[PDB]
Each structure stands twice: as C-alpha cells, then as structure tokens.
Amino acid sequence: QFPKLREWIGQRVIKDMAAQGYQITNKLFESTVGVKRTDIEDDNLGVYGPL
C-alpha cells in the first residue's frame, strides 16, 4: 500500500513500500493394494468387482 498522507513538516521525506511473497512446493502421494491373482480368477461371486 501507498504511505498515508501526512502534513508537510518542512521537507518532504522519501518513503518505501513493502512487498513480500510466498512459495509452496508440490508433494507426491501414493496408495496401492496387492491381491493374489487366483482370488480374482476364483471370483465367481463378484466380491472384488467394485475395486
């Protein structure tokens, strides 16, 4: 923001602004499950279908 306006005291003063920043790094995520193939092959019921 610009500095607030003030009454001139006799000699004007140079002021400065304040700028900042913010950084965020990506993160890597994982989720996995292992199942024996014979169970899927022997899945006539269909229990593992909604996996």
Next chain:
Amino acid sequence: AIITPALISALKTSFQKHFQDALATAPSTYLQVATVIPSTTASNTYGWLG
C-alpha cells in the same frame, strides 16, 4: 293370532350385514423401514467390499 313362540316369534326378523367389516386393521408400514429382497433358495448370503 295364537301361534307357537318358536316359529313366528323366531322368524319375525330381518337379517342385515351392517356390522360386517365395521372396523379395520392397522395399515401396512413395514415398507417404510425395510426393503424387499426376493430369494430363490434356502438362504441368501450377502457380501460387500471394504
């Protein structure tokens, strides 16, 4: 005039069926708390995945 009280005094009546079905029974409600799952054998086994 004179007659046995087991024939005229018995047959001087008119049967009516107003009293039939005068009251009722509580309405069906199990639909609001249960689903209908038809079965085709002795028992039903249920299985769902986690």
